[PDB]
Each structure stands twice: as C-alpha cells, then as structure tokens.
Design an enzyme around this catalytic site. Sequence first.
Site, PDB file in Angstrom:
ATOM      1  N   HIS A  41       0.809  -1.219   0.000  1.00  0.00           N
ATOM      2  CA  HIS A  41       0.000   0.000   0.000  1.00  0.00           C
ATOM      3  C   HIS A  41       0.854   1.286   0.000  1.00  0.00           C
ATOM      4  O   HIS A  41       0.284   2.373   0.067  1.00  0.00           O
ATOM      5  CB  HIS A  41      -1.074   0.017   1.100  1.00  0.00           C
ATOM      6  CG  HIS A  41      -0.542   0.081   2.494  1.00  0.00           C
ATOM      7  ND1 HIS A  41      -0.432   1.279   3.169  1.00  0.00           N
ATOM      8  CD2 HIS A  41      -0.129  -0.916   3.308  1.00  0.00           C
ATOM      9  CE1 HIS A  41       0.055   0.978   4.363  1.00  0.00           C
ATOM     10  NE2 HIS A  41       0.257  -0.331   4.494  1.00  0.00           N
ATOM     11  N   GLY A 143       2.545   6.492   9.868  1.00  0.00           N
ATOM     12  CA  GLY A 143       3.925   6.397   9.400  1.00  0.00           C
ATOM     13  C   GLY A 143       4.666   5.175   9.917  1.00  0.00           C
ATOM     14  O   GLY A 143       5.858   5.014   9.631  1.00  0.00           O
ATOM     15  N   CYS A 145       3.727   1.933   9.281  1.00  0.00           N
ATOM     16  CA  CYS A 145       3.540   0.778   8.408  1.00  0.00           C
ATOM     17  C   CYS A 145       4.905   0.305   7.924  1.00  0.00           C
ATOM     18  O   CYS A 145       5.754   1.130   7.593  1.00  0.00           O
ATOM     19  CB  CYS A 145       2.628   1.135   7.243  1.00  0.00           C
ATOM     20  SG  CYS A 145       0.906   1.428   7.710  1.00  0.00           S
TER      21      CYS A 145
HETATM   22  C1  LIG Z   1      -1.985   8.602   3.955  1.00  0.00           C
HETATM   23  C2  LIG Z   1      -2.054   7.861   2.650  1.00  0.00           C
HETATM   24  O1  LIG Z   1      -2.496   8.386   1.633  1.00  0.00           O
HETATM   25  N1  LIG Z   1      -1.658   6.563   2.636  1.00  0.00           N
HETATM   26  C3  LIG Z   1      -2.383   5.463   1.994  1.00  0.00           C
HETATM   27  C4  LIG Z   1      -1.652   4.241   2.541  1.00  0.00           C
HETATM   28  C5  LIG Z   1      -0.215   4.750   2.395  1.00  0.00           C
HETATM   29  C6  LIG Z   1      -0.466   5.973   3.282  1.00  0.00           C
HETATM   30  C7  LIG Z   1      -0.887   5.232   4.549  1.00  0.00           C
HETATM   31  N2  LIG Z   1      -1.832   4.255   4.007  1.00  0.00           N
HETATM   32  C8  LIG Z   1      -2.815   3.581   4.636  1.00  0.00           C
HETATM   33  O2  LIG Z   1      -3.862   3.358   4.041  1.00  0.00           O
HETATM   34  C9  LIG Z   1      -2.569   3.146   6.066  1.00  0.00           C
HETATM   35  C10 LIG Z   1      -3.855   2.878   6.890  1.00  0.00           C
HETATM   36  C11 LIG Z   1      -3.579   2.582   8.385  1.00  0.00           C
HETATM   37  O3  LIG Z   1      -4.261   1.772   8.996  1.00  0.00           O
HETATM   38  N3  LIG Z   1      -2.581   3.292   8.974  1.00  0.00           N
HETATM   39  C12 LIG Z   1      -2.122   3.190  10.308  1.00  0.00           C
HETATM   40  C13 LIG Z   1      -1.366   2.116  10.784  1.00  0.00           C
HETATM   41  N4  LIG Z   1      -1.041   1.907  12.067  1.00  0.00           N
HETATM   42  C14 LIG Z   1      -1.468   2.790  12.958  1.00  0.00           C
HETATM   43  C15 LIG Z   1      -2.223   3.943  12.638  1.00  0.00           C
HETATM   44  C16 LIG Z   1      -2.669   4.872  13.611  1.00  0.00           C
HETATM   45  C17 LIG Z   1      -3.389   5.972  13.246  1.00  0.00           C
HETATM   46  C18 LIG Z   1      -3.696   6.205  11.912  1.00  0.00           C
HETATM   47  C19 LIG Z   1      -3.291   5.331  10.940  1.00  0.00           C
HETATM   48  C20 LIG Z   1      -2.549   4.165  11.269  1.00  0.00           C
HETATM   49  C21 LIG Z   1      -4.758   4.132   6.937  1.00  0.00           C
HETATM   50  C22 LIG Z   1      -6.177   3.788   7.339  1.00  0.00           C
HETATM   51  O4  LIG Z   1      -6.780   2.852   6.425  1.00  0.00           O
HETATM   52  C23 LIG Z   1      -6.030   1.743   6.123  1.00  0.00           C
HETATM   53  C24 LIG Z   1      -6.739   0.671   5.601  1.00  0.00           C
HETATM   54  C25 LIG Z   1      -6.056  -0.455   5.176  1.00  0.00           C
HETATM   55  C26 LIG Z   1      -4.680  -0.485   5.268  1.00  0.00           C
HETATM   56 CL1  LIG Z   1      -3.821  -1.897   4.703  1.00  0.00          CL
HETATM   57  C27 LIG Z   1      -3.959   0.567   5.807  1.00  0.00           C
HETATM   58  C28 LIG Z   1      -4.631   1.705   6.259  1.00  0.00           C
END
Ligand SMILES: CC(=O)N1C[C@H]2C[C@@H]1CN2C(=O)C[C@@]1(C(=O)Nc2cncc3ccccc23)CCOc2ccc(Cl)cc21
Lengths: 302, 298
Positions: A41, A143, A145
């Site tokens: 992702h 940030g 991931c």
């Molecule tokens: C910011 C951006 O444009 N990005 C897109 C990709 C690349 C960048 C980040 N992205 C995501 O999607 C990540 C994301 C996610 O879960 N991120 C996070 C992970 N751990 C802790 C967090 C604590 C607070 C906030 C976000 C956290 C966002 C929430 O939704 C999902 C749905 C599925 C999937 Cl696999 C990942 C996600």
Amino acid sequence: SGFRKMAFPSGKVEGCMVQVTCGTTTLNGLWLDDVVYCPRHVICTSEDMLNPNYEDLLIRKSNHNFLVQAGNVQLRVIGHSMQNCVLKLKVDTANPKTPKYKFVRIQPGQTFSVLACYNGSPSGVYQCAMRPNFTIKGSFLNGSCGSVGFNIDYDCVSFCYMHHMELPTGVHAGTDLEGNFYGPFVDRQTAQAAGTDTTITVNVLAWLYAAVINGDRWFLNRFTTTLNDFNLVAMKYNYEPLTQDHVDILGPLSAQTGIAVLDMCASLKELLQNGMNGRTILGSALLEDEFTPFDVVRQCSG
Amino acid sequence: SGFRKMAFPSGKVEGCMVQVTCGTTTLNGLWLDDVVYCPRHVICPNYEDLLIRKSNHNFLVQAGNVQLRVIGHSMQNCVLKLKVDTANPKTPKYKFVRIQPGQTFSVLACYNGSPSGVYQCAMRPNFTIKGSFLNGSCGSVGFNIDYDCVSFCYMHHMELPTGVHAGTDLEGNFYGPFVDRQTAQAAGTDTTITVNVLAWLYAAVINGDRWFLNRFTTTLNDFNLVAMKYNYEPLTQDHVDILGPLSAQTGIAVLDMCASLKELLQNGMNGRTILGSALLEDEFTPFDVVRQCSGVTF
Ligand SMILES: CC(=O)N1C[C@H]2C[C@@H]1CN2C(=O)C[C@@]1(C(=O)Nc2cncc3ccccc23)CCOc2ccc(Cl)cc21
Ligand SMILES: [Cl-]
C-alpha cells in the site's frame, strides 16, 4: 527472580530499517541483503485505498519512483516485484548489517517483539502476542507501516510480522514477511472489523506456572479437572479451548513446579470464578496471556 | 493508537556488552572506548585490598568470540574500570547520568556478555528496580537514548530478598541505602510514583479511555493529604508543570486529573480497566507518554 514483559534486543533489526517513499506516501522497509521489503500500500493514494488494483498501479511505476533511504545514504532501486501484500524492491547495495534471518509465519498465541519505526528510524521496541482474532494490540501511529515483529532465537532473527493497518477498534493488522495477511484482513479502506477476541488459555497457564516458580502459590487449589470440563468453563469466560497439544507443551513447566497441567487448569477455573480478590499474581491484577510456555522457560531458566 | 511498555532500541548498547571473568565469577561489562566497566564484586570485603592482589591478566574480557587484553585497572566506587588494549569501534555517543526515583529506563539483560532481552522499568521511590534478573546478569545496564546519545544510568549489582534489584549509576554510586556485599539488606517501604500515574491517566484519555474523568477539581495540598494516605509520592508543583503539555493536549487541568485519581484511590476501578490494566500504572513518565503518543525516533 523477577518477571517482566521482555522484548528481544532490537539491534539486529535496527540495522535493517529503511525509509520507503513513493510519491506522497512515506512508510518503513526491511532491508535484508539487496532487497527492501515493505507494505504494497506504499503505491496507493488516499482515494485508491477503497478498491485498489495493486497489479495495475505497480505496472505504472518505475524503479526511480521508489526512494529508499538507509540513514543519510539513498539506495538505488534496480527492480521491483510483489509477493502477496508486500512489495519487494531490489536495490543496488546489499545490507552489510544483514543478520542471520528466517521468514516465519506464526500461529495465534505466539509472541514477538515489535520494533516501532517512523521514517525508517526505530523509536521503540515492545513485546506483542498474535491475538486469537489475528490482530495485535500494538502501539502504532501514522507512518509506522512496515514496522516488523521478530523473535531472536540463538543468533537468528525470525521475522514473523510486518505492520499494515490499524483497525477501527485501535488494534492492528499486518502480514508475515511473505506478504500473507494474518486473519481475514485485506489491504483496503473497506469496513473491516476484528473478530470477538479471546484469552490465550495456554499462555495464561504458562504465566501461572511462572508465578509458582517465583513463589506465588496463593491461587493453587486441591482440585484437578478433566480437559473437557475445563473447556466448558473456559468457553464461558471467553477463553481459547485448551487442546491436548497445549497440555503437552505445558509438560516441562508441570515437571519443574510439580503441578499437573489439569491441576493448574483447576487453579485457573477458580481464578475465573472468584477473581484476584485484591491480590496480584506476578504484580498483575489481571490474568496475563502474552507469555508463551517457551517465553516462561526462557525467562525463568535461560 | 495503542499503549505499550516500550523500551529504547537496544542496538547502541548491544555493541558494548562484553563478558568479564575473574576466577569463578563471570558477569557482564560495558565497553566504552578503551575501558570496560563492570561491578567491582567480580573480584569477590576490603575492595582496595582484594584488587591489589589481582593483576591485569586475571580479568578475562570477551567481546563476542574475540578476547580483549586488559592493560590496566582502577576502581570508581562500586564499579571496576578495566583499561583494555582495544577501543570499542561500536562505541556510541554516550553520557553517564544519575537518575532520580520515578525516572524510567531500559534494561538490556545479559548473560555471558550476550544480550538476551530488553525491557522498561522505573527507578522506584525506595531506590530499587522491579527487574527481571537471573544468576550471571550483574553488569547489565539501564539506559535512555535521547536523540542519538545513550545515557547510561544504571548497572545491575544484586537482588534483594524480596525479588527487587539494586544497582549503581555508571560512576559506581549505588542507588539507595544499599552496599555490594552478602548482608541483611531490605528494600524500604515502596510508594507509587504519582506524576507517572497521572501521565498514564493522560495517555488513557488520548486513547479514548475517559470513564474515570469527573466534573471535579482539587488543590495541590488537598490532593497530597489523600495521596499520602494511599502510599503515593507527594505531587510537587514541578510535577504539575511537567504535566503541562499533556494537560493542554487533552484539555484536562492537572488538578482536574488529580481529582479523577482521588476518586480512583477512594473507590477503585469498579470492575473497569484503564489501558488494559486493573491497577494504576506508575512506570511511564510524562515524557514517555509524550514520546509514545507523538512518535519520537532514534
Ligand atoms: C496517507 C495515505 O495516503 N496513505 C495510503 C496508505 C499509504 C499511506 C498510509 N496508508 C494507509 O492506508 C494506512 C492505513 C492505516 O491503517 N494506517 C495506520 C497504521 N497503524 C497505525 C495507525 C494509527 C493511526 C492512523 C493510521 C494508522 C490508513 C487507514 O486505512 C487503512 C486501511 C487499510 C490499510 Cl492496509 C492501511 C490503512
Ligand atoms: Cl507459532
């Protein structure tokens, strides 16, 4: 004496952490030899996340689109493939700090250390268990991931997890280092929910044994139970069914303490029935399920 | 989201762990530049008299498979300083600091100069640490990594009869009324680190846990009269000022959060839990909470 939630020394994993940037997205990568592993992702935009076609998005990407940064040094991407939900970026330089490692897929109840990272810089290390619902109760921010979960047994680092997503209940979902997610989760912004969580019974019993080794015996009783009778009671308290394999795995602890596995199951039945009653087992007012039978033998012997 | 007992990445400290052997005793040492630091009880009590018998080649320092040859030896308080022929190439940017009770640090547990685990713990008000130590762990160090500098603040020496640990700062000065010999030594009556509990209550608010909050507030003296009764450390005005950032981030005044803690002490958890705990956690400083709930990397 002493019982702590102990993580593995992060040293061998810190030397592997890089910063993977692809457009506006900036997450972490695990640099092992000439390959950087990171969540796929990284190629997604914020809108793409609902229904991304990663195969379609990666084919529109060239090597110089991925900006890998190992400290101040920038790594030159020379290739890119995708294995399930992880991106495998081939790089021009091999990591000199590459440890002896294995990619291992863990089963729920197994514990591991998480090296939390932001911009390829390790900020903290902690101990985690793979919950029965296939999520982890981590400590992750935006940030993070690409932060990895590992176990250092002997001098070999067994990478077992890479962080991908935080579910709406604050729990986390991620894959093994081969890109296969743990649980019924996908790399999508779709409505996903962690299943009803349960207590890891074998892990609680192992912790109850660790307490007996530390002189805590107040919870022990004159009772024993049949395996099936224990599971009927454990089911009511939202505990995982204790299998015959769990009983066999608890064998060494049962011999070291002299308390049969089903004898310790009877102590646990009474603990579930009466509660702690103002007491604490190993400094805790709750029944701890994040120490495997192996973690206890490691920490109370070597 | 998520709140865990997080330790500092042990990497910079692992590159400093050596095995110090002197006769039968085999403990750990911290190799910084051309000096190995280790408990002075490895020669084991007139320590000046015992050390003058030992020669340089009596100390067998081992950095992994490589053996370090000792070229000199001095003693600073309860710490042996072995001068070695080779300077540690993996020496980080470091400081020797002495911490105050309530301050937290990471412990890199070692056996035979091989790091086996890392964990977080707090310097208890009674100057002991609730650590996880076995035989051969003496010389394991406690540190804090600020920016890129490792602040060594503790070296493990012994375990008290109640399972708690005692050790020195890296300058050999013990924390507490403890000495480095087999004698009757008991940890004093322990108290809860009040500022640390409040900081953890703030971290819970940040994580959506708000059930414990109430409409009330209190005064610094009225709270301390209550805290004293429940074996809590007196909350000073400095503690209030240090909790300032957390109070602004959540919008709950420090004495407002003290009023919530006052009711948790008088009424208990009531079958409920804060950040997965049924007890009030005191091993996260106001800075540990700020670093974990904002993401500061090293
Ligand atoms: C910011 C951006 O444009 N990005 C897109 C990709 C690349 C960048 C980040 N992205 C995501 O999607 C990540 C994301 C996610 O879960 N991120 C996070 C992970 N751990 C802790 C967090 C604590 C607070 C906030 C976000 C956290 C966002 C929430 O939704 C999902 C749905 C599925 C999937 Cl696999 C990942 C996600
Ligand atoms: Cl497993």
